[PDB]
Design a protein. Structure first.
Ligand code: SF4
Ligand code: SF4
Ligand code: SF4
Ligand code: FES
Ligand SMILES: [K+]
Ligand SMILES: [Zn+2]
Lengths: 124, 181, 218, 240, 157, 112
């Protein structure tokens, strides 16, 4: 409708089509940043007149992939430790407080951590 | 000494059997290598497949968790200061001496002499009226001998060597070899 | 009323009752500081400004110690260098490794003063980990990352004395002390955003400006 | 006839916790510092009329002279038996717009005789002349040409002074501090004129000034004093 | 054996007569755990305004917890001693000084007993422990440190 | 001083008849307590009213035509900056640095 293709939204109101070349990403229709130029507007340029849009680089949207990861629930501890699950090949190790009654993501990886006592509240 | 080395002691691919005997007969210098690296020895474990477990090397005095105050090894902030000697300060050092060999009066009588060199004092005037033994002992060296330009490395000597030692071209070639001595 | 004191062999003269850190600035001697600001009330909770009084067996905080006539102040002895490295190590003990994701990166006083006066290496290898503090919500202007706070009370002093907003304070005791409003509310002040400039670390940052630039670019 | 050993399989030494000395690198120059102080003072004593001042930093000696004294000092440092600096390894300049005389003209001399190096410093403005040491050192011909090309310093007495680095007809002296790093113009091929032409500079991406991110705190202190004890003004003895 | 109760006689021997509170310790007691209790006391009783004692007492408490079990190294005995020096003389009040002496008292006269715990602890774990209580297999996975004995001694709760 | 050194510098005439330079001492940043950057006098040029910055459509680059946009001279004294600006025949103006008023500050004032 060209409104979902040119406006930043938290979620796509429809199912992304992997074969649609007007989407921002193969797995996401709408852009994920307010300053991110829409792909449909970008491809409407004189330099795409005789160019095949299918072979252009279209990496998957990282925002949709990170939220497919289940929340890590910590038992008998209010602090979560994350370093990228790689150690020396990850990110600097940081400590996440889990006192609040919600899942709190990592500052680097985006993995979300929470206490098991809040599992019922978060899922609903 | 890097004398001649047999071909089989060099890490290059060589000949075998009859073809090795033929090579020795036909080659002018049979101990020379073909220059082809050994496929079974050279770079056989590639750098990306090394089994060595690397560890960061740390020295004890400067890389330990104890007795390792940083200011004890902070050489960057303990750099030598930049000091320039003009003709006024050189005249003061010549007239009053140095702190190593003081020649300045004591007490308030000595501070009068120091305050003289707080303004412009020409060195030529200082040299004109001064005891000549001071110049021969402070400005000059060894009782009046001129001050030679100091060497950047006092251990930079040389000695002429012959072919039997350095192994380079014989004496009929127009170059010579100097050792450390 | 002027008193002729000495700071590293430099004659200084300021009004009676002036702090040593004020006389040092007039003499051209730089003393590191976190909790001292020339517009806020005097606090001595950061201990980064410690200097050595000539005839005294105790180290005095230059931001709070009044000046006396004939006082001689040393600010660069090895004893003070030990104090600066020791205080820096304590500040960075529980500080989160957040510089890449922290908006104070290129304009951080904790970074610059740790580089200038602290050691080049840390010794915190504890497996228990650092302190973790939840982020307080105080409105849409001030973004809070309270892991990065060094408990310097610049925000508390400013909002209570200068801004006149007493809803911001320090709650708790010891290592569990947390800056904030205790209850879930916002800071109501037309001058509240000046707390972002006063905060020397990334604990309090601009929310509209978050993540958009680094100071060296501007 | 024996096979060559596998260097990978050869045993390697085992090392415990390594140790290393911790000392100031300036300590190894203690002999060089004092000797250069004496030699630098000897030159001032020999030439009080020309040597304004001298300085010593580790193993580098610098002599400061006026432009009218450059020829005499260089001649002395070249022909004196105690200081035979026959080789002039470099002639360069530096721009200091703050001072009345912008440019410091620097001469680095080498004495293969005594294995020593010395430095001569003079000053110049945009219009003041500097004597050419080409008659003394023929190797300074190109260095003085390069200094003029990048700074504009007037070398009086140079047999052939002209550009050596910039394009023919270049306007400006690049190494001056007021000269922009990207210059003023750029070149391209004009199809209409069938030749390469100069056009005013326009950058598709302007150079980004990240130097404004310099630290707001001083990084190095006042340093440590390494003046030889034989070159400090003495302190008089106290009261009786 | 020859201590006289005075503000000076006890000062000479390296101690102090604060409130005459004499605490007797027989040989059948955990001396390191007793001193560890003092460190945990001052961490909880720290008012927490100055940087040293707010952070040092927590730093001392974390290190003393590994000493009571032996999950540390012998060189770290000098590390904790240095950390106590960084607390003394750099605080507004005397609680920072009061939180460093008990640790130093353990090190001064009872250092061999602290080394014994480290030697004994390595026997159970087999491989020696690295700095901070880490092993050769300990790594962080999914929000926690696994494959490593963690000193869960922070009052739980 | 009176010498018109711009006749031999080689710089284009637009630096004199079209550009304005500012002689200033950098103000202390509000986010930091350091004052090292305020100890030196600097000279920069006012931006061009047009063409100072424009967006390149191919990649979003910041295009410019001002060749002095990235030039900032450093001086140790105010007099040196004025003497150099006068020597080059530049049209300039001086921004006098703001000086902080001294007020006594003691811990006793927290209660009195
Ligand atoms: S406040 Fe400073 S030290 Fe802390 S994370 Fe941010 S930039 Fe790094
Ligand atoms: S939040 Fe910032 S200003 Fe407030 S006490 Fe902590 S470091 Fe200081
Ligand atoms: S040393 Fe005293 S005043 Fe300072 S934080 Fe500790 S208990 Fe509070
Ligand atoms: S600046 Fe003085 S103790 Fe904080
Ligand atoms: K801030
Ligand atoms: Zn992570």
């Amino acid at each position: 409708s060209t409104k979902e293709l040119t406006t930043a939204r938290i979620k796509d109101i429809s199912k992304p089509d992997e074969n649609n070349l007007q989407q921002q990403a193969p797995n996401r229709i709408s852009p994920w940043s307010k300053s991110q130029k829409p792909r449909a507007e970008a491809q409407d340029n004189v330099r795409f007149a005789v160019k095949d849009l299918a072979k252009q680089p279209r990496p998957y949207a990282a925002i949709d992939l990170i939220y497919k990861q289940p929340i890590r629930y910590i038992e008998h501890d209010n602090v979560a430790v994350c370093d990228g699950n790689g150690g020396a090949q990850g990110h600097p190790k940081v400590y996440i407080n889990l006192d609040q009654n919600k899942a709190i993501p990592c500052g680097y990886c985006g993995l979300r951590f929470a206490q098991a006592a809040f599992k019922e509240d978060i899922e609903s | 000494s890097g004398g001649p080395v047999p071909v089989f002691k060099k890490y290059t691919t060589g000949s075998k059997g009859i073809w090795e005997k033929i090579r020795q007969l036909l080659t002018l210098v049979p101990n020379r290598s073909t220059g082809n690296p050994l496929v079974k020895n050279y770079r056989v474990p590639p750098p990306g497949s090394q089994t060595l477990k690397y560890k960061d090397p740390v020295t004890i005095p400067a890389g330990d968790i104890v007795k390792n105050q940083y200011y004890d090894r902070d050489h960057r902030r303990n750099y030598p200061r930049l000091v320039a000697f003009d003709q006024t300060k050189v005249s003061g050092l010549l007239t009053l001496g140095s702190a190593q060999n003081p020649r300045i009066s004591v007490g308030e009588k000595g501070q009068k002499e120091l305050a003289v060199f707080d303004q412009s004092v020409s060195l030529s005037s200082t040299l004109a009226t001064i005891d000549p033994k001071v110049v021969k002992s402070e400005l000059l060296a060894e009782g009046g001998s001129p001050v030679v330009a100091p060497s950047l490395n006092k251990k930079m000597k040389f000695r002429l060597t012959e072919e039997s030692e350095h192994g380079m071209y014989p004496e009929d070639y127009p170059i010579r070899i100097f050792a450390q001595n | 009323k002027e008193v002729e004191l000495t700071v590293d062999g430099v004659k200084v003269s300021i009004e009676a009752g002036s702090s040593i850190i004020q006389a040092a600035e007039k003499a051209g001697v730089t003393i590191p500081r976190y909790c001292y600001h020339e517009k806020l009330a005097v606090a001595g909770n950061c201990r980064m400004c410690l200097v050595e009084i000539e005839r005294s067996p105790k180290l005095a905080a230059s931001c709070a110690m009044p000046v006396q006539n004939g006082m001689s102040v040393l600010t660069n002895t090895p004893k003070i260098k030990k104090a600066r490295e020791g205080v820096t190590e304590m500040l960075l003990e529980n500080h989160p490794l957040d510089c890449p994701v922290c908006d104070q990166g290129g304009e951080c006083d904790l970074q610059e003063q740790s580089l200038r006066y602290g050691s080049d290496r840390g010794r915190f290898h504890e497996i228990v980990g650092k302190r973790a503090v939840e982020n307080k919500a105080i409105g849409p202007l001030i973004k809070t990352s309270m892991n990065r706070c060094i408990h310097c009370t610049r925000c508390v002093r400013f909002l209570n004395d200068v801004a006149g907003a007493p809803e911001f304070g320090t709650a708790g005791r010891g290592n569990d002390m947390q800056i904030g409003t205790y209850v879930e509310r916002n800071v109501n002040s037309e001058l509240s955003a000046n707390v972002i400039d006063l905060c020397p670390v990334g604990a309090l940052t601009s929310k509209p400006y978050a993540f958009r630039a680094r100071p060296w670019e501007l | 006839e024996e096979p060559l050993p596998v260097l990978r399989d050869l045993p390697r030494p085992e090392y415990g916790e390594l140790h290393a000395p911790v000392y100031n690198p300036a300590e190894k120059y203690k002999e060089q510092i004092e000797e250069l102080h004496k030699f630098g003072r000897y030159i001032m004593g020999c030439l009080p009329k020309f040597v304004q001042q001298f300085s010593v930093w580790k193993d580098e000696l610098v002599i400061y002279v006026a432009p009218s004294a450059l020829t005499q000092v260089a001649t002395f440092l070249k022909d004196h038996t105690s200081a035979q600096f026959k080789a002039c390894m470099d002639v360069t300049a530096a721009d200091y717009p703050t001072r009345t005389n912008r440019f410091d003209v620097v001469y680095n001399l080498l004495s293969v005789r005594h294995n020593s190096r010395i430095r001569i410093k003079t000053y110049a403005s945009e219009v003041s002349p500097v004597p050419s040491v080409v008659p003394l050192f023929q190797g300074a011909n190109w260095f003085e040409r390069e200094t003029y090309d990048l700074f504009g310093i007037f070398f009086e007495g140079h047999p052939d002074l002209r550009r050596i680095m910039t394009d023919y007809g270049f306007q400006g002296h690049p190494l001056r501090k007021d000269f922009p790093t990207t210059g003023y113009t750029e070149v391209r091929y004009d199809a209409e004129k069938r030749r390469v032409v100069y056009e005013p500079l326009e950058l598709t991406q302007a150079w980004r000034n990240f130097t404004v991110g310099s630290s707001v705190w001083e990084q190095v202190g006042d340093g440590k004093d390494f003046t030889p004890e034989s070159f400090k003004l003495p302190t008089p003895a106290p009261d009786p | 054996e020859d201590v006289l109760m005075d503000f000076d006689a006890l000062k000479d021997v390296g101690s102090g007569l604060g409130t005459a509170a004499v605490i007797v310790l027989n040989k059948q007691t955990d001396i390191i755990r007793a001193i560890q209790r003092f460190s945990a006391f001052y961490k909880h009783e720290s008012c927490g305004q100055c940087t040293p004692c707010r952070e040092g007492t927590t730093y001392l408490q974390r290190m003393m917890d590994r000493f009571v079990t032996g999950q540390a190294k012998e060189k770290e005995i000098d590390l904790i001693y240095e950390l106590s020096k960084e607390i003394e003389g750099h605080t507004i009040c005397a609680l920072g000084d009061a939180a460093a002496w008990p640790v130093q008292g353990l090190i001064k006269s009872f250092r061999p007993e602290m080394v014994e715990r480290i030697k004994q602890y390595e026997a159970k774990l087999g491989e020696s422990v690295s700095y901070g209580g880490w092993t050769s297999k300990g790594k962080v996975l999914d929000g926690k440190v696994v494959s490593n004995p963690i000193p869960h001694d922070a009052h739980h709760h | 001083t009176d010498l018109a050194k711009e006749l031999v510098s080689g710089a284009p005439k637009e630096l004199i008849t079209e550009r304005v330079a500012r002689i200033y001492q950098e103000a202390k940043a509000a986010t930091q307590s350091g004052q090292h950057n305020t100890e030196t006098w600097k000279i920069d040029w006012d931006i061009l009213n047009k063409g100072n910055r424009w967006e390149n459509d191919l990649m979003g680059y910041q295009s410019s035509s001002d060749y002095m946009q990235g030039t900032i001279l450093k001086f140790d004294t105010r007099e040196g900056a004025i003497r150099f600006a006068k020597g080059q025949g530049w049209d300039y103006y001086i921004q006098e640095p703001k000086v902080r008023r001294f007020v006594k500050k003691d811990y006793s004032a927290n209660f009195y």
